[PDB]
Each structure stands twice: as structure tokens, then as C-alpha cells.
């Protein structure tokens, strides 16, 4: 790999075949003489043989005066330039005015004084003379071998001396062409600046915007003009008006306009030099035939030397002057001579009229009116294998989206495509055509080397850039922040302390985002909602610490469904849940007819209260239900016959026991079928959830515990009746804390002091008086001990409870569910203290209400319309014995998943949940029997899916007063929950989950919407969605860069630069025993004599595309190596599932992922602006005002300058502190073009300083050339990059297509393809280069 990269690759592989061809050391050499020992001298003595060789000369090149480039520069030979320090030119521009008769102020006289300088240049070449070659140059020769040894050394010295003089005449033409190219700004800038019809008002703020909007429009429409005219009909007429556009944009305002340096042979003057490569020149000779092929210029340099009067002031004063004799003959000889033009033209022509004329061979051409010479200097850069400077490498940026969601009134235009018109299908990839027309896909699994990285998953880097943006935040209401624990178990006390005299109701930052639509959040009248949209995965708020001023903290969202409705809308969660259905191939057991039964019970105004009394007496027990199965078969039957609805739908354990334990004809056969279909659904859901979770394990912990939240056992079901709290602790690496009031609960070894169990009733017939002694004596407001039944691990499974309360009940009831709390000893006081229960004289198999009195049971049994027997209520009386105490709440604080243990504060690593012990959730209580419910039950709002005001106002008339005093809180999303029961930021379910369930349609597709909504939003869940080609809850944008080998055309007008050529000076610097080296220096100065720009460059023809336009994501594990997760078994798992000898298409393009809301517009991705979401043009605003140019980039009080309607496309990347600002504002990052604040503020100055800096200085960190992985460049020696996107802050769109077929329709008809189909789109590319696109045989230009 060293044979090819070394220059002259054909002579290298040929000269390195000598090792195979050589057999004796006199192989290629000829024989000349013989050295005998005498005259014959023996046949056996040693004879010597003089060997001669063949040398080829150095190919000489045309000197500088005989090239046609010297029509652009004025040549003088300044003999001693190594003595010069500086040189200056001083202009004095007097300006006339117009005298007019309006009222405005007449102008006085004005002058300008302009001071130009001299740039100095230094050239060095080395010459090696061998010490064996110098030694015989001074020796005495007297034999015919020493004459042919001497003559072979005088030729070696001169051929090394012709080489050094060759490498300086190459050095002139390189350093003149390097001066011409640093002051050569391109056409698209200078065509508008060169016309004074735009800047006649002065460059205001609105003229610069109209002028930058023509920098873009000429860069796209008129670029690579000799390649755009291969496929036009006009052809010659288009190139000629393009190349007489370059000809006139140059200002011909030179001091040497009157000085006639070069002429034509006919008498006209050569106006300029038009320099191309070889490949462009042979096409400008066919479009434009040469007219003369002859010119006549000077033959020698003008000679300037410091003679007798300058030499005194050069020695003594240290300042000299050009042509002292003219300065002295005007100051003292004619002091009153006014500056006239013709009397001065001899003096301004600094000897350039005295030089002898000659005959110069150069290919002229006529362009409209002017005679213009055309060169090609490629034949001097090919002979020495250096890169020609006119093969600049233009580097463009490109961007395309992937995975978006199109809004609800879906349309189409096309008539061809058929297969992909479904509303349930969603693309998860976009197709990009490669350089060699290989249409490649960019999926999420290709996108995973940079997502699953802990720079994407921590707020500690993002809450510090947000704290330097708004350093003094007002911590206002601290509402949903933290759980203030107090020692109570009376949940009627903490309920009644909070809603007593509440007159003001606060809404958090989160509960007012899930009601805003996708378009209201981006409109610039809302700073405050849009300001804390910083990160996709996290959720920010204001914490009151430190001191009196706030600070920003963050909680993780933990799910896909905690993304708000502006960023994951309602019809997207449905079409993401229908993709959950298609991969697992699950079949819904529940039909729409059974949801129609469950929903009618939830909105029942006459639901019986008596089935709450049964469910409170069972409280989820195996034994206690079998005792009462001849009673609940009457409550269900007298509610299915009297009305089409079915009872006992509240909790899971009543639905489970009805399906399993009957198996008979007690319930009617139609009514029992609806119960079987519920448990048929829940089992089929967890069959599907165990397919996508996979079989494999990270470490001790499986991945089924870590992909979804419906399978993670740390999420407890909201109503626990058993000892679920100790079964969690013995099988958990995430260390839990149960807070039973004040005292924490840590270890399973301390179970007896905190948790008191109560087993079977048949086993507890002995210790049963000891239960009632604790009902009277103990203080239950400060008991701190919860009573639950012992649980058997072969009986239950927590996932079916979790699929019931969190998926099926918020859908089918549409979120009308509150946590009903029970006072148990007041329930059975109605039942046992009856009188037909107590008196044993009454018949057991007799009707109840024939014998019962005016109490509450006459009014409760009038609700359910039940005629039970006396045996039935007497069995319900027996359930009072092992009946638990008041319903309690235990807050289960567990640590977060190892993919989620990055937090701003110390409490942010712990997620929490309050589980209502011995209580049950219940629907809207019937208004005919609220008096009976007011004597038995009370509401406990404790969760987002279980805090509903229209249900909770029924249970207690104080909350019915609270809802009717201020009707803001009548929604479930808005409603205030006490701070002793719930804090929303420290919670799994975090209000945008509770806002989806209130706006469902209760569709069978909405059941599977919720199951694909409890999908963990972490790094090792994104692997499990990328294998099955699912859609995680965010789309993303890609950014690339691509190089182009553009062959250019340089024009440079007549006599603009003036050169000062010194003398070559030899300096010996090394003497060895083997050879002597030298170094020839040669110093050149050069000054620009014109005022405006005098040379203009243009891209003409693309030679090749270097970088292939293929998908290759930038892995963040190489760029940030020190980052790691807390685990090592999980950092080695992600690094394994995410991630060259030789490449096939070309240099690989790095792709960078900017995550984006799924509701972002496709019509942003068609027009070429940057992927920030806001425009970053700083040339528009005022000069040197750094405080004003920052309001463009980051302030959202204003709309962005692109769109007057919205403010920002993606708030996840535009703002201060956002994930785009965190990663890419501080290998090669194409997003550093767009996000880096310091580089953008370089273009705040005046737009003529930018043009001077454009061609001269290379920009901030571009990419390397011909390296496999596209590194960042340094030292810039032979580096010819031209990036016009760093000035305009825009990226050009490519071919993207959401499906394969949309790109097969673009090929077949370029005009009438639909850009937006129903779910799918196509971005037709708007790039400054056009290409041929061949997919098969069909061509789209």
C-alpha cells in the first residue's frame, strides 16, 4: 500500500521491476573503454570496463512572460526585494455631487484615502550535488578516461542547475495563480454585488435579505453551466450569455487602464485571461472558435532599481520610493501643476511603454465585444504530479427525514399506486438513491449506532445549558413536584383537609401540554410550553431550590405514551398499535359488541350499589367468594334480565372468578359469554407481549422485564389485596421502598412488624376473637401496619391484573373511574343489625324485603331490585370476621431501569407508585342512592387513570361543591389530587397517558393502542423495535456531506495585479561526506491595484462525485468513548447489538441523527433550509451587533424568518439546551455547520468583509479528502475545499421516499407524480447539481 500512494504511479511500478530483471550489475549499461594493465597485459590479469548510461533530460516549461496569464498581471523586476519591509499604494478619491433644488441638505466636498499593501511570497527548491561529483571538478585530467569522466560531471551539475531554475519558473506561475485565486469570489456572490442597481439605497437590513436571496437562487439555477448546457436546446446561446456574464461582472477599474500592456495582432487590446483545465478548454474551443491565436506583448520585465537619490534615503531614513525623478520634478519644478490625465500618463506607465515588443502565441477568442485569451495550466501540474488549483472540491450538505406521520385528512393525487393506501400502515424507513444508483434504505436499525448512547439519555448536560439560558427562573406553584409524607392512614382525613376551602386550582406544565394540539404549541404566542420541550425522552420543570430563585430539573418519561399529543397525536398511537398487531399476529378475542356492553355499564345512571357491598365483602379472596356464589348469581341475573348490561366489572378478581369457578348454567349463557371474552383477550395480549420481548437475557435479569412496562413487575397493579409487597422485594435488583405512612419498609426480614397477614377463614376460627379486640382498641389513624392475604405464586400472575386496570378499563370506561375507599365496620352494621338476619324465627328460604324495616337495606336492595333469601345475607354477615380495616395506600418507591438511571437530581433516579390496599375502583354511583353511599363509601384519588371528578363528586358532597364552584377541574387531565396521595412528576403514568384514554373511541384497535403505549422508551427497547421494524415514538432527520470534483473557470481582467520578481539566491545549508545540498530561495511580492474585485471563479463541469451518497450512521461510541451505563453487562449488551478492507462505491458519508417530533411538516423538508427548525442567516441582520443576532437563532418571541406562522419545526433541536444544542454545539460532524454558535457569529460582520474572507480563509472544520471514514481536516497544505452552505446556513434535500413504490412512480413520470400520497411522501431533490438517475433503463434528469 506504499507503491500506489507514492507519486508517479506508472513509473513507480515500472522502475520497481528492476529487482526481477537485473541479473548482473552491468545489465543496462553500455561498454565504452577498456583499462588494461599494459598493452595486452595478459589474458589473465584484471581488465576494467568503462560503463556508460542513458539519462533523459528535465522537461522544460514555458517561462512566465510567454504564458498568456501575464495579461492579468503587470511584471516588474525589483532586484533587491529581500531588503524591502513593506510597500504601499495610496489612493485619493475625490467625489463629485449633484446640486439640486429640493429641501434636503446639499453635500459638501468629500474625499477618500485608500491604503493598499504588499503581500510577500517565498519559494524554495533543493538541489543535491554528490560529493563524488564535486571532487573531480577541480582535479587535473591527462588521460582519455578523465576527459569522459569530467564531461559526465559537468553535465550532472548543470542538469541539477537547470532543474533549480525550472522549479522557480514553475514557482512563479503557481504563486501568481495562487494570488489570483484568493481574490476570486464566485459568480453567485459577485453578480449581484457587481450591479449597483441593488445597493443604490445603501445596504440596509432589507437589501441584504433580498441580496442573500439571490445568492441562493443563482447557486441552484446557474451552476455547473457547461454541464447544464449539454442537455438544453439553446446550448451555445446559454453558455455565451453565461460567460459574457462573468466577463462584465468584474470591475475594469484599474490604474493601468490607459497603459497598453498587451494588444492583439490587429490593434485591439486583450481584455482578460480565461483560465480553465484541459477538459473545459477543449469544449470552449468548439462553442467559441478561436479568432487570432496571436498576441503581442512585452518581452522583458520592467526594471526598477534604487539609484543615487533613493539609495541615500534607503540607507539613512530606511524608506525609499518608486521613481524619485518624477516626485522631484513635480514638487519643486512645477509646484502648481494640477493633476491632468494625459500629462501624467508617461509617469504612471512605470516603464511599461518602453519595453520591447514581441510575438506571443496564445489562443484568443471573441466574447461579444472583448478579445479574451484562454489558457490551461494543467500541463505544468501534471508533469510534477501536484494537484492543479482549478480542480477545487466543492462540498455540499444534504438532509432528508425518516418516519414521519401525516395529519388526519389524508389525501392523494396519484392514479398508479395501489398497495399502500391503508391508514394503518406506517413507513419506518426512507429510500435514498446512491451515487451509483443503488437505492438504499435508512431504517431505524441502521440508525441505532447513535441513538443507544448515553449522550442521548441524560439531562445533566442539558439542564446546565438551560440554566445558562434563563438563570433566574421564578419557581411559582410547586404543585406536582414531590410526595409530602404525613403519618395518617385515615384516607378520609387527607382527602378532607385538601378540598375544604380550596378556591384556586393549579395546572402543572405537563397537564396543559396534553390538551394543546400539534399546531398551537409551535405558534409563537406560547413561549412557556415550548420553552421546556427541551429533550425527547425527559420532562423538565422548575424546582424552588437554591435560595429564593429556582433551578431546572428533569424526570424521565418512561413510556411512549408520556410524549404529549402535540408530539405523538391520537391517530399516531392507534397506527403504532395496529403495527403491534401485525407483527405478533395476535387475534382479538374481544369484538366491538362486548366493548359496547362494558361501556354501557360505565355510563349507567342506575348502576346498583349493592354489587359494591358484595365486592367490598369479598375483597379479592378465593375462599370468601365460593361462600357467596349462590348470591352473586342472583345479582348478575337480575341485572342482565332487567337491563341489557352486566355487573361486577369493577375489579379484576371478580371478573376472573366468574369465568373459572362456575362452568355451569347459573348466569345466563349469553351473559356468561361476555365474561369469557374478557379473559380471552387478556391472555392473548400477554401471548403477544412475550413474542416481541424476545427470549434472551442481559444478565440475571431477562429482557422481558425491560422492554415494556406491562411486563415489568415493579409496576404494581393499582389495587393490591395480597402480600404483593414482599414478593417484589425477594426478586428485585432495583431496590424498592414501601412507605406505609411514615416508616419506610426495606427488607423482607422485617415483614412481621410492618405487614400482618390473614389466611383462610376456616383456619382462623380459633384466633377470631383476637381480631375483633383490635377493631376497638387500636388507633387506625396511626397504625402503620397493613392487612393483606397471603399469596400463592402458582395462583396469580401480575400481568393479567396489569393488562386489566391499565389497558382495558381506561379504554372501555373512557376514564370515568375513581378509587372508592370502604369503611368496613359500617358496611356490616347495615347487614347484621337487620332483624330478619338476627331473629332465627324467620324462615331461611324466604324473601328479605317482606320482613325488613325502614333502614338502609330497604333502600340499597331497592336499587338492585334484588329479592334474595335470608340464607344469602347471613352468609355475607360471616365475612365480617376476617374483614380488613380501613383502606390504606402504600407508595412503592423503586429505582429506575439501568437504561434510565441518568437524572438531574438525586430523587430523580427513583420512580414511584401508590397502590391502594383493600380498596377498589368504581364507576359513577347511582344518583337515586347517593344517600346510602354517603353512609358507606368515600373517594380516594390516587392515580392518573383513577382520579375522575365526575365520579368523585358523586361519592362525597364536598367534592360536588368543589367541582361546581370552579368548573376548570371537571376534566380528568386537569383535576387536582392531594399532595399526600400523588405527585405527578414522580410517577409512571404521568398525565398524557391519562389524556389518551379520555378521548378514545373504545374500538378494538384502541385496546392494542394502549398495549403499544406502555412501551419502554429506553436504549435496549429500541433494539427490540428495530428488529421487527416497529416505530419508536420519534422521527429523525439525517444530515450528510458530499464532495464534488468541480473543474472551474477562472476569469481575471487585464493588468489588475502587479508583480515584483526578485532574484534567485543560492544558500548552502548542508555538507555531508556523501553529498552536498543547497536551497534556492526566490522572493515575490504582489499588490492588488484595483479597488473592487478583479477576478471571478465559477464551477463549470463536475469531473466526478467522490463521496458516495449512501447511508452510514456516525456511531457515538467512537466520538464519546468515556461514556458508559451504570451496568457493565448492559453496556456490553448495547455495544454488541449496535456495533473496512475495501469500499465499493466510494468514500463513506457520515449520517447524523437529529430526532424530531412525528408531527413535523414534510413541506419543511422540500425547501432547502437547515435542520435546526429555524433559519440561521446572520448576514441579514445588523453588523457587529452580537446581542441582536442571537435573537434570530434562539429566541421564540418572534416567528422564525422562514415562516411567519410557526416559530420552530422541531423544539427538540432548535432551542437553547435542547438535544440538538447539547450534542452538536460544543471525526467529522456535518451538524457542526448548523448548531455551533461561535462559527455562525463569524458572519455577523459587513458583507464585503465576508466576501474577502470567503475565498481567502478556509472555514471552520471541513472534511478530509480521499480517506475512508471522512475525518476532519488539519494543516490545509494542498486542501482545496469550497463549501457554500456554511455561509448561507442551508442544506439541500435529496431523494427520500417512504415506500419502495413511490420511488418507482417518480421514475416512470417526472411531472405527474404525487409528492404526498396518503401515508407516504417523496422529496424531489433541489440541489445545485443535477444528475442522471437510472434505475434500470428509465432516465429521470
Amino acid at each position: 500500500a506504499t507503491l500506489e500512494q507514492r507519486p508517479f504511479p506508472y513509473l513507480a511500478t515500472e522502475a520497481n521491476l528492476l529487482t526481477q530483471i537485473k541479473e548482473s550489475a552491468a545489465d543496462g549499461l553500455f561498454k565504452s573503454f577498456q583499462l588494461l594493465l599494459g598493452k595486452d597485459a595478459r589474458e589473465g590479469s584484471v581488465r576494467f570496463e568503462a560503463l556508460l548510461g542513458v539519462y533523459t533530460n528535465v522537461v522544460e516549461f514555458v517561462k512566465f512572460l510567454e504564458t498568456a496569464l501575464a495579461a492579468a498581471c503587470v511584471n516588474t523586476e525589483f532586484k533587491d526585494l529581500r531588503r524591502m519591509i513593506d510597500g504601499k499604494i495610496q489612493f485619493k478619491i475625490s467625489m463629485p455631487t449633484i446640486a439640486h433644488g429640493d429641501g434636503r441638505r446639499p453635500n459638501k466636498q468629500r474625499q477618500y484615502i485608500v491604503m493598499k499593501a504588499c503581500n510577500k511570497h517565498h519559494i524554495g527548491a533543493e538541489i543535491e550535488l554528490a560529493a563524488a561529483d564535486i571532487e573531480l571538478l577541480f582535479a587535473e585530467k591527462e588521460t582519455p578516461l578523465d576527459f569522459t569522466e569530467y564531461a559526465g560531471a559537468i553535465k550532472t551539475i548543470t542538469s541539477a542547475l537547470q532543474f533549480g531554475m525550472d522549479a522557480l519558473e514553475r514557482g512563479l506561475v503557481d504563486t501568481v495563480l495562487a494570488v489570483k485565486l484568493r481574490h476570486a469570489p464566485p459568480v453567485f456572490i459577485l453578480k449581484t454585488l457587481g450591479d449597483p442597481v441593488y445597493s443604490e439605497r445603501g445596504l440596509k437590513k432589507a437589501v441584504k435579505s433580498d441580496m442573500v436571496s439571490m445568492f441562493k437562487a443563482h447557486l441552484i439555477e446557474h451552476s455547473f453551466f457547461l454541464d447544464k448546457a449539454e442537455l438544453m436546446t439553446r446550448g451555445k446561446q446559454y453558455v455565451l450569455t453565461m460567460l459574457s456574464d462573468m466577463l462584465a461582472a468584474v470591475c475594469e477599474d484599474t490604474v493601468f487602464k490607459g497603459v497598453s500592456t498587451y494588444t492583439t495582432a490587429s490593434g485591439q487590446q486583450v481584455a482578460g485571461v480565461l483560465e480553465t483545465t484541459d477538459s473545459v478548454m477543449r469544449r470552449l474551443m468548439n462553442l467559441l472558435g478561436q479568432v487570432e491565436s496571436a498576441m503581442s506583448g512585452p518581452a522583458a520585465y520592467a526594471s526598477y532599481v534604487v539609484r543615487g537619490a533613493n539609495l541615500v534615503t534607503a540607507v539613512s531614513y530606511g524608506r525609499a520610493m518608486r521613481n524619485f525623478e518624477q516626485f522631484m520634478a513635480r514638487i519643486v519644478d512645477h509646484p502648481n501643476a494640477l493633476p491632468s490625465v494625459e500629462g501624467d500618463k508617461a509617469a504612471l506607465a512605470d516603464g511599461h511603454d518602453e519595453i520591447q515588443r514581441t510575438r506571443i502565441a496564445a489562443s484568443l477568442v471573441k466574447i461579444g465585444d472583448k478579445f479574451v485569451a484562454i489558457e490551461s495550466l494543467q500541463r505544468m501540474y501534471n508533469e510534477t504530479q501536484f494537484p492543479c488549483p482549478l480542480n477545487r472540491r466543492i462540498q455540499y450538505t444534504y438532509f432528508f427525514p425518516v418516519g414521519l406521520h401525516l395529519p388526519v385528512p389524508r389525501y392523494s393525487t396519484s392514479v398508479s399506486v395501489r398497495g399502500v393506501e391503508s391508514p394503518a400502515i406506517q413507513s419506518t424507513e426512507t429510500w435514498v438513491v446512491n451515487k451509483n444508483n443503488v437505492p438504499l434504505c435508512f431504517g431505524y436499525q441502521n440508525a441505532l449506532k447513535s441513538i443507544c448512547h448515553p449522550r442521548m439519555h441524560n439531562p445533566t448536560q442539558s439542564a446546565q445549558a438551560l440554566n445558562q439560558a434563563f438563570p433566574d427562573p421564578d419557581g411559582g406553584h410547586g404543585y406536582g413536584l414531590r410526595y409530602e409524607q404525613t403519618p395518617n392512614m385515615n384516607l378520609f382525613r387527607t382527602f378532607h383537609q385538601y378540598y375544604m376551602g380550596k378556591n384556586v386550582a393549579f395546572v402543572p406544565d405537563v397537564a396543559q401540554k396534553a390538551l394543546v394540539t400539534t399546531e398551537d404549541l409551535l405558534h409563537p404566542t406560547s413561549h412557556r410550553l415550548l420553552r421546556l420541550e427541551v429533550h425527547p425522552f425527559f420532562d423538565f420543570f422548575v424546582h424552588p431550590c437554591p435560595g429564593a430563585r429556582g433551578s431546572y430539573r428533569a424526570t424521565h418519561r418512561t413510556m411512549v405514551g408520556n410524549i404529549p399529543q402535540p408530539l405523538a397525536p391520537r391517530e399516531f398511537q392507534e397506527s403504532r398499535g395496529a403495527q403491534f398487531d401485525a407483527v405478533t399476529n395476535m387475534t382479538h378475542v374481544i369484538d366491538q359488541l362486548t366493548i359496547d356492553v362494558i361501556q354501557e355499564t360505565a355510563f349507567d345512571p342506575a348502576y346498583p350499589l349493592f354489587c359494591y357491598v358484595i365486592e367490598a365483602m369479598i375483597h379479592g379472596q378465593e375462599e370468601k367468594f365460593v361462600m357467596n356464589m349462590p348470591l352473586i348469581a342472583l345479582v348478575i341475573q337480575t341485572y342482565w334480565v332487567n337491563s341489557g348490561k352486566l355487573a361486577f366489572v369493577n375489579s379484576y378478581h371478580m371478573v376472573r372468578f366468574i369465568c373459572t369457578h362456575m362452568g355451569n348454567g347459573s348466569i345466563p349463557k349469553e351473559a356468561h359469554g361476555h365474561y369469557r371474552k374478557i379473559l380471552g383477550e387478556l391472555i392473548a395480549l400477554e401471548q403477544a407481549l412475550l413474542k416481541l420481548a424476545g427470549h434472551e437475557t442481559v444478565g440475571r435479569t431477562p429482557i422481558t422485564h425491560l422492554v415494556s412496562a406491562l411486563l415489568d413487575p415493579h409496576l404494581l397493579p393499582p389495587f393490591a389485596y395480597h402480600d404483593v409487597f414482599t414478593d417484589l422485594m425477594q426478586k428485585s435488583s432495583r431496590q424498592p421502598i414501601i412507605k406505609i405512612g411514615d416508616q419506610n419498609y426495606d427488607n423482607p426480614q422485617n415483614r412481621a412488624t410492618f405487614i400482618n397477614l390473614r389466611g383462610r377463614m376456616e383456619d382462623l376460627v380459633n384466633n377470631l376473637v383476637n381480631i375483633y379486640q383490635t377493631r376497638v382498641n387500636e388507633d387506625h389513624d396511626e397504625r402503620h401496619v397493613l392487612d393483606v392475604a397471603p399469596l400463592d405464586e402458582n395462583d396469580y400472575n401480575p400481568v393479567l391484573e396489569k393488562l386489566f386496570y391499565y389497558v382495558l378499563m381506561p379504554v372501555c370506561s373512557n376514564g370515568h373511574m375513581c378509587g372508592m375507599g370502604v369503611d368496613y365496620q359500617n358496611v356490616a352494621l347495615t347487614l347484621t343489625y337487620n332483624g330478619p338476619v338476627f331473629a332465627d324465627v324467620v324462615n331461611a328460604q324466604d324473601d328479605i324485603l317482606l320482613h325488613l324495616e325502614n333502614g338502609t337495606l330497604k333502600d340499597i336492595l331497592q336499587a338492585g331490585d334484588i329479592r334474595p333469601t335470608v340464607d344469602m345475607i347471613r352468609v355475607l354477615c360471616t365475612s365480617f370476621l376476617t374483614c380488613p380495616f380501613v383502606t390504606q395506600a402504600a407508595r412503592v418507591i423503586t429505582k429506575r431501569d439501568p437504561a434510565q438511571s441518568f437524572a438531574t437530581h438525586e430523587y430523580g433516579k427513583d420512580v414511584a407508585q401508590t397502590v391502594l390496599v383493600n380498596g377498589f375502583g368504581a364507576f359513577a354511583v347511582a344518583d337515586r342512592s347517593r344517600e346510602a353511599a354517603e353512609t358507606m363509601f368515600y373517594p380516594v384519588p390516587f392515580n392518573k387513570l383513577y382520579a375522575d371528578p365526575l365520579v368523585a363528586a358523586t361519592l362525597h358532597p364536598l367534592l360536588a361543591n368543589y367541582v361546581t364552584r370552579l368548573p376548570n377541574q371537571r376534566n380528568a387531565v386537569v383535576f387536582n389530587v392531594p399532595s399526600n396521595l400523588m405527585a405527578e412528576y414522580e410517577e409512571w403514568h404521568k398525565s398524557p397517558v391519562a389524556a389518551y384514554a379520555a378521548s378514545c373511541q373504545a374500538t378494538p384497535g384502541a385496546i392494542s393502542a394502549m398495549v403499544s403505549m406502555h412501551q419502554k422508551l429506553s436504549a435496549p427497547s429500541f433494539i427490540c423495535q428495530a428488529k421487527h421494524r416497529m416505530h419508536p415514538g420519534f422521527a429523525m432527520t439525517v444530515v450528510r456531506t458530499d464532495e464534488v470534483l468541480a473543474e472551474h473557470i477562472l476569469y481575471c481582467s487585464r493588468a489588475s495585479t502587479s508583480m515584483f520578481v526578485g532574484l534567485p539566491s543560492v544558500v548552502r545549508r548542508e555538507v555531508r561526506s556523501d553529498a552536498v545540498t543547497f536551497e534556492i530561495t526566490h522572493e515575490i511580492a504582489s499588490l492588488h491595484t484595483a479597488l473592487g474585485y478583479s477576478s471571478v471563479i465559477a464551477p463549470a463541469h463536475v469531473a466526478a462525485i467522490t463521496t458516495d451518497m449512501g447511508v452510514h450512521c456516525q456511531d457515538l461510541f467512537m466520538i464519546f468513548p468515556g461514556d458508559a451505563y451504570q451496568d457493565r453487562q448492559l453496556h456490553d449488551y448495547i455495544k454488541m447489538k449496535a456495533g473496512l478492507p475495501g469500499l465499493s462505491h466510494g468514500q463513506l458519508a457520515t449520517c447524523e441523527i437529529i430526532p424530531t417530533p412525528v408531527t413535523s411538516d414534510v413541506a419543511y423538508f422540500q425547501t432547502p433550509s437547515n435542520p435546526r427548525g429555524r433559519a440561521a442567516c446572520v448576514v441579514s441582520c445588523d453588523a457587529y451587533s452580537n446581542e441582536s443576532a442571537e435573537r434570530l437563532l434562539y429566541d421564540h418571541s418572534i416567528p422564525d424568518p422562514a415562516y411567519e406562522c410557526r416559530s420552530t419545526n422541531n423544539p427538540w433541536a432548535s432551542q437553547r439546551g435542547s438535544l440538538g444544542d447539547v450534542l452538536y454545539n460544543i471525526m467529522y460532524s456535518p451538524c457542526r455547520q448548523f448548531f455551533h454558535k461561535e462559527d455562525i457569529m463569524r458572519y455577523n460582520r459587513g458583507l464585503y468583509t465576508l466576501v474577502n474572507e470567503y475565498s481567502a480563509r478556509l472555514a471552520g472544520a471541513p472534511a478530509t479528502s480521499t480517506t475512508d471514514l471522512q475525518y476532519v481536516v488539519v494543516n490545509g497544505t494542498d486542501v482545496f475545499l469550497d463549501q457554500p452552505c456554511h455561509m448561507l446556513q442551508e442544506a439541500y434535500p435529496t431523494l427520500a421516499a417512504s415506500h419502495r413504490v413511490m420511488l418507482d412512480e417518480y421514475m416512470s413520470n417526472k411531472q405527474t407524480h404525487a409528492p404526498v400520497h396518503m401515508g407516504q411522501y417523496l422529496i424531489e431533490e433541489v440541489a445545485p447539481m443535477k444528475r442522471l438517475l437510472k434505475l434500470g433503463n428509465k432516465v429521470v434528469y
Binding site: 421564578d474 431550590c545 429564593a548 421502598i737 419506610n744 438525586e906
Partner: protein, 344 residues
Amino acid sequence: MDAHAINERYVGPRCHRLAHVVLPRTFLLHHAIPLEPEIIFSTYTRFSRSPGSSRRLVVCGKRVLPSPSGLALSLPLFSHDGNFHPFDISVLRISCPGSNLSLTVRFLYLSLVVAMGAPPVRLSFNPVNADVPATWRDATNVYSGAPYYVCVYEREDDWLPIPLSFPEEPVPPPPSLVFMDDLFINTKQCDFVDTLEAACRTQGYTLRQRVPVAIPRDAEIADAVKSHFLEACLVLRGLASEASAWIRAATSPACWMDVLGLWESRPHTLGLELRGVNCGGTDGDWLEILKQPDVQKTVSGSLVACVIVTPALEAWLVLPGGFAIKGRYRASKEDLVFIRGRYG
């Protein structure tokens, strides 16, 4: 678990016994100890019935990754004159070098001493090792009520128990000798507020402005500023804290400020130093106080009061609106020895 055996070699000879202590996450969650590796611990014990101060020793602490799990430490126990005292607080002070963090964790010896109850010359090479097995014995903290574990490592040893010297009569009750700090600081706060109320009586039950802040003209606002003063007297009296501003001013070798949280809307941040501000009491010195970002919000805003303590133990209670009352902490010469010993 390496953090125990490192301290037996370097903290060991500077002590009498080491209390090897492992703090679980349940103890860490209450005191909010964010386990970064930059934290530099420091330990000193506050004596009783003797001149109370010992030397500060820097103790290594390492997180244990998993049979318990949590932060591992080693507390020094000091036997002055051959025996331990039962009521003797061993104070742990937790702080970061760069950022702003200061925590005080305190342990009592009866929760520690009880938990301890069941030819070329060769050179000696004694590396640090975790070869010695641990015995894990339960303990509960007296001050918070959070459990922590105590290691007893294997080594006139088995013959004797670990010595104690119980206090003698006459004695204060042991609930009042345990909280010796929280009953001395509380009575300096309850006597500070009695100076703030005494300045109202000598003025005529008025509050005068000190800071030039325009107040909007509404009668309900003028009655609300009075409610910030009476709420500040409920908070200053209930506050019995180790890290108050006047303790920082008494042990100073600079104005020491501590803002409050009225009506429990904020937790307290105490002991903030006002660097570059000399509280002389002249009108040109209140501009330097208003250049602090806290006092711009304790005055323009609401629900926050603010106390600024001079080095001369005179303190103003700054109310929203610019109203202030000069008050005085009275600390005698006997109590400055009591404070600069145990705290400074």
C-alpha cells in the same frame, strides 16, 4: 468493602477504635447523599461533660456494588482517658470540593458501641486486603430513624466488653442530653425573635422601609406584607438547625445570609455568605445587598423572608417590600466557647 481496610492503616493509628459502618440506600435517600466519587468526607466527635472538640479526620468512602448494598465508611471513636462515653455524638460532614454541597450526619456512641458487641534481609510486605470476613449487625439511627449496618472484623480481648462510663447524678434527662445542640440553638432563636418583637414596641408596632421598592397601591397587599412578618416569627422560632447563619458568623475566622421558606413553600438554604458586602447599615451599603440576586427576589417577590447576619451578631429580618427590623443575637463569652468548640 475496600474502604474499611484502607482506613485501618491510615485513620487507624490516629484513633482509638474505628466504627466500620455501611449505609444502605434507605439511609441515603433520607439524607440525600448523591454518590459521586468526588465527595470528601470528614469526621469529628462532639464531646459531652468535657471541653467538646476533637480533630477532624478525612475518611474514605466507596460505594459497594452487589449481603447489603450501600455506601461504606469508617467512623472514628475516641477514648479519652481509657473509656468511651455513652452520650457522645460522632459527626460526619459530607461535602463536594467544587460544587456547593454540605451535609451533616450524626451518630451516637450507644448505637455504635452496642453494635460492636457480639544473607539478604527480608522486607515485610503487607498489602491492603479484603481477606478478613465481615459480621453484619443491625443498627438504627437515633436522629432520623433509618437503619444502617456495622461491620465487626475478625482480628485481654475476649475477657472484657467494650468500656463505657455512664453519666452521673445530677444529670439532665437523656432525651435532653442527646439533643444538646437542638435545645441550645433553639433558645438562641427564641431569644432572637424576642428582640425583633421588642423593636416593634419601641417604634409603636410599625414596620419602616429600608430598601427603595415601589409597592402597588392596593389595600389587600399592605395587609399581606404584615402576614409575612408574623409567619417569619413562626419559622424562626421553630428553626433549630446546626448550620444557621449566626453560627457561621460566630465561628467566622463578611455578612452571613440565610433565606427562609415561609408557609413551608420552600426548604431552607442556610449560611449563604455575602462576599464583598460590608453590612455597615449606611444607605450606600444596601445597594451592595440589593446587587445580590436573592435579596432582589425576597423583596420584589413574596413568600420568602431573609435574614442577614453581621459579624457583630446583629441581624436584620428583610421582608418583601424592603421592610426590615434590626435584631440582635445575644451570645455571652461562655457560649462562644461552647459554639466555637463543637462547631468551629
